[PDB]
Amino acid sequence: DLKGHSVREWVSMAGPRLEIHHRFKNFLRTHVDSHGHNVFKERISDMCKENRESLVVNYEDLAAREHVLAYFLPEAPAELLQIFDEAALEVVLAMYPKYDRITNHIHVRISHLPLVEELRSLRQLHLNQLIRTSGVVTSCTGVLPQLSMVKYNCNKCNFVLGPFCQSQNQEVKPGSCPECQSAGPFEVNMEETIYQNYQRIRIQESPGKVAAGRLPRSKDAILLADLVDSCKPGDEIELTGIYHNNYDGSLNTANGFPVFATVILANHVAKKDNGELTDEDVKMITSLSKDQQIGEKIFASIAPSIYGHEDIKRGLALALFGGEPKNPGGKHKVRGDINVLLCGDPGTAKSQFLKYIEKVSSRAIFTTGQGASAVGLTAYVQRHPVSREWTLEAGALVLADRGVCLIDEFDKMNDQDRTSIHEAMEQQSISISKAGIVTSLQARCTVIAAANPIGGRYDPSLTFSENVDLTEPIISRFDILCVVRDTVDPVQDEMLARFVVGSHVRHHPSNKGVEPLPQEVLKKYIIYAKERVHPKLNQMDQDKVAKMYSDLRKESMATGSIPITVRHIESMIRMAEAHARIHLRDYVIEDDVNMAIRVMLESFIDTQKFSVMRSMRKTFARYLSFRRDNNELLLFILKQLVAEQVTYQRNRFGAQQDTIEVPEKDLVDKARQINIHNLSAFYDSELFRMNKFSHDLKRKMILQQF
Amino acid sequence: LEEAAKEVADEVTRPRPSGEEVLQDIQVMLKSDASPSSIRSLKSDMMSH
Amino acid sequence: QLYCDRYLCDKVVPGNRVTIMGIYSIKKFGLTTSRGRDRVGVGIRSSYI
Amino acid sequence: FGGTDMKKAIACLLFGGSRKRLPDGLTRRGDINLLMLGDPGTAKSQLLK
Amino acid sequence: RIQETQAELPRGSIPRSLEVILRAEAVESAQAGDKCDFTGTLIVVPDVSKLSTPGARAETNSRVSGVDGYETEGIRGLRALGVRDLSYRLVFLACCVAPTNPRFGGKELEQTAESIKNQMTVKEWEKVFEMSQDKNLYHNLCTSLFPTIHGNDEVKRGVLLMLFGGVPKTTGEGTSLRGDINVCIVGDPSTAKSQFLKHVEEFSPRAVYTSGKASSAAGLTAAVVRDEESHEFVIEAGALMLADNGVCCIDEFDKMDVRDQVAIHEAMEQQTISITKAGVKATLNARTSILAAANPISGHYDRSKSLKQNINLSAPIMSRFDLFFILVDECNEVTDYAIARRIVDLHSRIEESIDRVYSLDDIRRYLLFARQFKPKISKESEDFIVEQYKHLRQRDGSGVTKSSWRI
Amino acid sequence: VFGRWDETKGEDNIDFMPTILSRFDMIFIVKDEHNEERDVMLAKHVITL
Ligand SMILES: Nc1ncnc2c1ncn2[C@@H]1O[C@H](COP(=O)(O)OP(=O)(O)OP(=O)(O)O)[C@@H](O)[C@H]1O
Ligand SMILES: Nc1ncnc2c1ncn2[C@@H]1O[C@H](COP(=O)(O)OP(=O)(O)O)[C@@H](O)[C@H]1O
Ligand SMILES: Nc1ncnc2c1ncn2[C@@H]1O[C@H](COP(=O)(O)OP(=O)(O)O)[C@@H](O)[C@H]1O
Ligand SMILES: [Mg+2]
Ligand SMILES: [Mg+2]
Ligand SMILES: [Mg+2]
Ligand SMILES: [Zn+2]
């Protein structure tokens, strides 16, 4: 039955121990299911399938079927768990008699233990009891080999002292050896000893779960033999274990008060989270690849939380997919990485863009030009602060060796950070010559950087290079230079304000998107981008491209501008390969080339001073408007005229007026200048209406509300 | 294996010029073509192997 | 931690990428573990190759 | 593409001259040094690499 | 570890610190930075520390004397006589901990609005409810918080709104939205920036006052020391932790070193302090409003320049201050008369001459209560916010004169 | 010095002091100002990729 004198002593007795053994056997065999399934049967099948030695028992159903054990278990978890382990072992041997050659021990883990105590509320009332806590892993040793069934050598007669069980709370020490009766020295026989995996993790309270004025408390837990490597620093886990006191932690060494250090013998770890498998998932990837508008869908599905900035989104999508690295022979190395530099005046979502890219990609590490980050750009070697291990801290650039290096505050780097980034962007490896280490460990990352312009505001009358605090060697290493530009447009101001205020409304702690194409969910999107397993190749036009570069050279050396160079066509090739990869094509097609030309030219043209930017916008407009439909071109022209008019009004009217208007005729004239001649669809357009525009055919006027 | 190597070296350098009379211990370094395993895979079941 | 010996000494320098072949082994200096503030862990010995 | 004279000069640098030490102890270097000045698109970093 | 309160300090002295021992149920009752009353006993604890000299010592009274070959001399003799040093240190053993100045007289204890209201007495919540219903409460709070300050009404209002703060939020993607405003006062000399900061420090609970070049990064954010008794690490809270859910008042903000400005900036970004030092790593938590006072470059604010051209704050710092207040000394004889009158009245009638409509304790209770409210934004508030933002941006356009800093 | 070698400011496009330019056996200047039919260079890059 039950009700002896002390639960631990109650279950230590042979009678209740054996009775508990049989009761747990009965529960394992006969706890079928809510619908007649015998969950433990196929659970043991899955365990013994892949040699897993771990049997997770839910607490809810154990308290249902056999509540007496469920009452006993928290009070005496060491003994009850020993009993459960042996009972499960013999049940498994009954089911798979051959399985006894594998590990001869089944670990019963216990899930959903009802009452969860948090790290700060643990007391000595909880000592030697099974508890559930929750927190964040802050530190985690390597897997250590712990003596499990240890055999010794009598180093007086070489007899191998028989296997002793190593408990978790006392160092096993033999007495005499049984042959020569020497009390004398022994040594671990490491060939006949068996070990088990041991890991020591530290878990603190979740920072959100910590109260107002209070610091997070932390505990050490011990993972053993099947639990090791189930946790990583920064993981939020649900840890079930024995709140344990009595091993060797007692300040008896006159250092002060006789306090006991405590540890948790982990029984069960549950990681509370959701990285890539791409199995059977490839057919739907190809299915939406067949969309023939997948490119715009993907451009629309990045940074869904940032309004506007469509061109930056397209460039970041290209960077995510990237081009084709090549090395003709072994003596001419061209990267496939597409590096993006966002230089824009403040509050324009550049930091948000970098944060999103870090979320959506694997092997992305975020670092900042200031000193405000976990990982810096430069390699160094030092004793690690928490692990105390002499480690080569290879910098941010090499930790993202086949991923993305996101560098915020790019204009605020040190001299040595600038040298590190120059070496990584140039040679794609980092050369250490620091302690005694001379090595060249490599860093083939795409660098996406965000910079603020000099003086806090971009000046279109200067070139890109002379309103950013970067040297030409650094700027030349970026395939896309995005000039973000904070200008006061009432319509976009309303749209962005609605966007962000809606965000603030819907995330209020109580209650816990505008494109032609549907956004694509970030999960299938991560998987889609991870379908970079297929390389890609191009055998398409060369006379059009060559003529385009020749014309660009003649213009950019006629006009006193930044000259186009070879690296611009090589970046155009990267962006063409990336665009082909977005469509899974395996061959650049003329539209891939055309879109890459448009992107390369948009990047190259916006980085000129204003006069040159206008001239190049004009002369290369046929290249520059590829897949740029009539509705958006016309909207751009209309915005230009209405802004001209508003400036005219407010210069000598004190403020802009209401019902700002513009004639039909001049819009018609400029639409002819770009050869439209058919404005009717523009007036019927969704885009025309969305921008608070209106067509007044009574007087050939078109006007805005505000 | 190293004791074997010492014996074989003895019987192939025999006889040795005077001064080289005492036979030396031979260290047997050993290599394989197998692909290396991860440093993370060094669990406890690999101890003493 | 790696432990090299007679002719394996100075075969490599810091910074080298290497493939090591050896015995996963523990330090055997006499089961006298009386450390100070840290090391709540019992039955644990230092590994090396 | 192009840069044939510069490539010949690179080959000369790669082989180098002769390093002499005269009887008075003074040394003449044999190594050639090249400087490439140019516009920032020409493949001269490529050529250093 | 507690330490002497500032009002108890004698001249020329550093505050004494003694370590108090809390037992079974008092065990979590005092948090770092809390003004607490400890009731208990002062005890001595034997401590192991010497080499000042051989001192007092204990030994057996039994008259033993070692034989030849076993002479009771040296270490064997000290061991045989049971000789040990009688060295002690004073420690407080507290049976009970209470706050020195309780907020609500009823009973301390999850901190919901109802929990705070239940925590009060009947008269206390009468007053809280009264002032909540107070029309013109905004002006009354401004006047009763800064009685001795003339003018500068906008700075009073902004500092008040900082004291109340906004609503923190979490985005579904995991983005954390700052929900508490930061205010920086920039001004000419003697325009009472330091006085605003001192007012807020002395009023607010969980408020810390720090200055420009007197604080290191560790003392401003976080430091790690090892527990003397166990294998764990105890974390020293710095200024930005003791101001969590409160205010950090950084005077002379322009004079802070960049090695410290980066730490302030990180805390103002993601409201945390991640520390990896001396064997332990830990992400601490800093939900602190910042009240900063800065001097302009060259001491005098130049109205013919932008705010950036006037203060040497880095753009990362400036961008995340909600309100900037420029306190320009205008040499107006009328305001000179008014300021002089208020100063002289303060110095003539010290304890009186302040008639504030709500006592500081009342306002503290009221603020602790009102911080538990998380207002929603209604639809009409969305529309009005959008319209106001459009107007504010229209201020930033060309034609009209330059603003001190962009919207 | 400025970023592109311009022939209007010859001998002013280099900021090296005379004592370094002595150390260099060969100094190459490279330009890109004008050639329409360096278009085979474009075709060459495309061919190589
Ligand atoms: N489409 C958008 N354009 C601009 N800002 C946006 C947009 N969508 C959201 N925001 C908001 O703008 C704020 C600006 O913060 P963010 O850090 O992204 O700017 P930043 O570009 O890094 O500025 P700075 O250059 O000053 O660092 C963000 O909090 C974000 O919520
Ligand atoms: N004949 C050539 N002239 C100029 N650039 C070339 C030529 N052939 C290839 N390139 C490419 O031009 C790109 C940029 O050149 P880079 O090596 O950065 O030169 P630099 O450092 O002088 O600007 C490189 O990818 C290089 O491979
Ligand atoms: N309305 C006011 N304007 C300016 N100074 C005032 C005002 N009211 C009081 N003062 C006095 O001016 C003195 C200087 O204030 P303080 O804050 O120390 O200078 P600073 O603003 O340079 O830090 C204070 O003692 C304060 O009492
Ligand atoms: Mg930013
Ligand atoms: Mg170069
Ligand atoms: Mg001051
Ligand atoms: Zn023996």
C24 touches chain B (CB under 8 A): yes
Choose one of D1, D42, D47, D48 to mutate for the ligand 2 pocket test, by most ligand atoms within 8 angstroms of C-beta: D42
User: Is the distance from CB of A154 to CB of A177 less than 8 angstroms?
Assistant: yes
The partner residue sitting opposite E244, judged by closest CB among A208, A212, A251, is: A212
Rounded CA-CA distance A493/D34 in Å is 56
List, in order, residues 6 or more apart from A698 with CB less than 8 Å away.
none
Residue of A nearest to D46 (CA): A332
Closest-CA residue, ligand 2 atom 3, reads D42
* Residue whose token pair is 């005229």: A641
The partner residue sitting opposite F46, judged by closest CB among A326, A472, A545, is: A545
Choose one of E143, E145, E148, E191 to mutate for the ligand 3 pocket test, by most ligand atoms within 8 angstroms of C-beta: E191
Quote the Cα angle for A575-A579-A584, to 5°. Answer: 140
Q: Which residues in F1-49 belong to E strands, given as ranges? A: 26-30
Closest-CA residue, ligand 3 atom 23, reads E194
User: Is the distance from CB of A104 to CB of A163 less than 8 angstroms?
Assistant: no
CA distances from F24 to D14, D35, D37, D40 (A): 15, 6, 12, 21
Inter-chain touch D40–A476, beta carbons under 8 Å: yes
CA distances from E369 to A509, E121, E207 (A): 18, 13, 17
CA distances from D5 to A239, A571, F27, F29, F36 (A): 71, 28, 12, 12, 22
CA distances from A583 to A47, A260, A626 (A): 42, 63, 17
Handedness of CA A109, A13, A29, A37 (dihedral sign): negative
Rounded CA-CA distance A304/A338 in Å is 21
Q: What resolution, expressed in A, was reported for this entry?
A: 2.6
User: Is the distance from CB of E175 to CB of A305 less than 8 angstroms?
Assistant: yes
DSSP codes, E27-86: TT---TT--EEEEEEEEEEE-----S----EE---S---PPTTS-S-HHHHHHHTT-EE-
Quote the Cα angle for A312-A313-A317, to 5°. Answer: 115
Residue E324 DSSP class: E
H or E, element range at A367? strand A364-368
Quote the Cα angle for E140-E143-E144, to 5°. Answer: 80
Rounded CA-CA distance A21/A79 in Å is 11
Angstroms from B40 CA to nearest CA on chain A = 8
Inter-chain touch F34–A542, beta carbons under 8 Å: no
Which residue ranges have their beta carbon within 6 Å of ligand 2?
A 334, 566-567, 570; D 1-2, 40-46; F 41, 45
* Residue whose token pair is 């030697």: A128
Helix ranges (DSSP H) in E307-399? 315-319, 333-348, 360-370, 379-395
User: Is the distance from CB of E389 to CB of A493 less than 8 angstroms?
Assistant: yes
- Cis amide prior to A77 (ω within 30 degrees): no
* Residue whose token pair is 């620091």: A434
Rounded CA-CA distance A675/A668 in Å is 10
Residue A564 DSSP class: P
Angstroms from C6 CA to nearest CA on chain A = 22
Rounded CA-CA distance A264/A128 in Å is 9
CA distances from A137 to A237, A273, B23 (A): 7, 13, 57
Query: How far does CA A22 lie from the centroid of its chain?
Result: 48
A599 touches chain C (CB under 8 A): no
C21 touches chain B (CB under 8 A): yes
Token code pair at residue E369: 């209560």
Q: Which residues of A319-338 are buried (b: 16+ CB within 10 A; e: fewer)?
A: bbbbbbeeeeeeeeebbbbb
* Residue whose token pair is 């709540």: C40
CA-nearest of A317, A315, A443 to A379 is A443
Judge if the beta carbon of residue A368 lies within 6 A of ligand 1: no
Number of A/F CB contacts below 8 angstroms equals: 41
* Residue whose token pair is 């498998």: A277
Burial class (CB in 10 A: 0-12, 13-18, 19+), E191: buried
Rounded CA-CA distance C42/A248 in Å is 9
Subunits with 3+ Cβ pairs within 8 Å of E are A, C
Token code pair at residue A695: 């067509």
User: Is the distance from CB of E196 to CB of E336 less than 8 angstroms?
Assistant: no
Inter-chain touch C14–A436, beta carbons under 8 Å: yes
Rounded CA-CA distance A212/A223 in Å is 32
Q: How many C-beta neighbours within 10 Å does residue A362 have? A: 12
What 3-state class would DSSP assign to A496? helix
Quote the Cα angle for A299-A303-A305, to 5°. Answer: 130
> For residue D40, which atom of ligand 2 is closest to its CA?
23
* Residue whose token pair is 């993981």: A235
Rounded CA-CA distance A574/A599 in Å is 11
Burial class (CB in 10 A: 0-12, 13-18, 19+), B44: buried
Q: For C26, what's the count of Cα atoms within 13 Å in the CB-facing half-sphere?
A: 26
Angstroms from D16 CA to nearest CA on chain A = 21
User: Is the distance from CB of A577 to CB of A538 less than 8 angstroms?
Assistant: yes
State phi, psi for E323 to the nearest 5 degrees: -130, 135
Burial class (CB in 10 A: 0-12, 13-18, 19+), E293: buried
Helix ranges (DSSP H) in E229-329? 239-242, 258-270, 315-319
Asked if residue A503 belongs to a known ligand binding site, the reply is: no
How was this structure determined? It was done by cryo-EM
A225 touches chain B (CB under 8 A): yes
D32 touches chain F (CB under 8 A): yes
User: Is the distance from CB of A625 to CB of A633 less than 8 angstroms?
Assistant: yes
Helix ranges (DSSP H) in A235-349? 282-289, 294-300, 310-321
User: Is the distance from CB of A595 to CB of A362 less than 8 angstroms?
Assistant: no
Rounded CA-CA distance B20/B25 in Å is 13
Inter-chain touch E282–A218, beta carbons under 8 Å: yes
> For residue A409, which atom of ligand 1 is closest to its CA?
27
Tell me the sheet residues that pair with A136: A204, A236
Rounded CA-CA distance A131/A135 in Å is 13
Token code pair at residue A111: 């899930």
Quote the Cα angle for A571-A573-A575, to 5°. Answer: 70
Burial class (CB in 10 A: 0-12, 13-18, 19+), A562: buried
Q: How many C-beta neighbours within 10 Å does residue E221 have? A: 25
Burial class (CB in 10 A: 0-12, 13-18, 19+), A424: buried
Inter-chain touch B40–A148, beta carbons under 8 Å: no
Closest-CA residue, ligand 1 atom 3, reads A348
Rounded CA-CA distance A152/A193 in Å is 8
User: Is the distance from CB of E38 to CB of E96 less than 8 angstroms?
Assistant: yes
Residue of A nearest to F1 (CA): A472
Inter-chain touch C40–E226, beta carbons under 8 Å: no
* Residue whose token pair is 């003449």: D28
A146 touches chain C (CB under 8 A): yes
User: Is the distance from CB of E266 to CB of A371 less than 8 angstroms?
Assistant: no
Q: How far apart are the first and last CA of chain C?
A: 7
Rounded CA-CA distance C37/E233 in Å is 11
Rounded CA-CA distance A152/E390 in Å is 81
User: Is the distance from CB of A160 to CB of A144 less than 8 angstroms?
Assistant: no
State phi, psi for E337 to the nearest 5 degrees: -60, -45
Angstroms from C49 CA to nearest CA on chain B = 9
State phi, psi for A160 to the nearest 5 degrees: -95, 105
Q: What is the greatest pairwise CA distance in chain C?
A: 39
Token code pair at residue A100: 């006894």
- C-chain CB neighbours of E226 within 8 Å are 37
Q: How many C-beta neighbours within 10 Å does residue A123 have? A: 12
Inter-chain touch C24–B27, beta carbons under 8 Å: no
Asked if residue E191 belongs to a known ligand binding site, the reply is: yes
User: Is the distance from CB of D9 to CB of D35 less than 8 angstroms?
Assistant: no
A609 CA → ligand 5 middle, Å: 23
E266 CA → ligand 6 middle, Å: 24
* Residue whose token pair is 């192939």: B12
Judge if the beta carbon of residue A603 lies within 6 A of ligand 1: no
* Residue whose token pair is 């509540």: A67
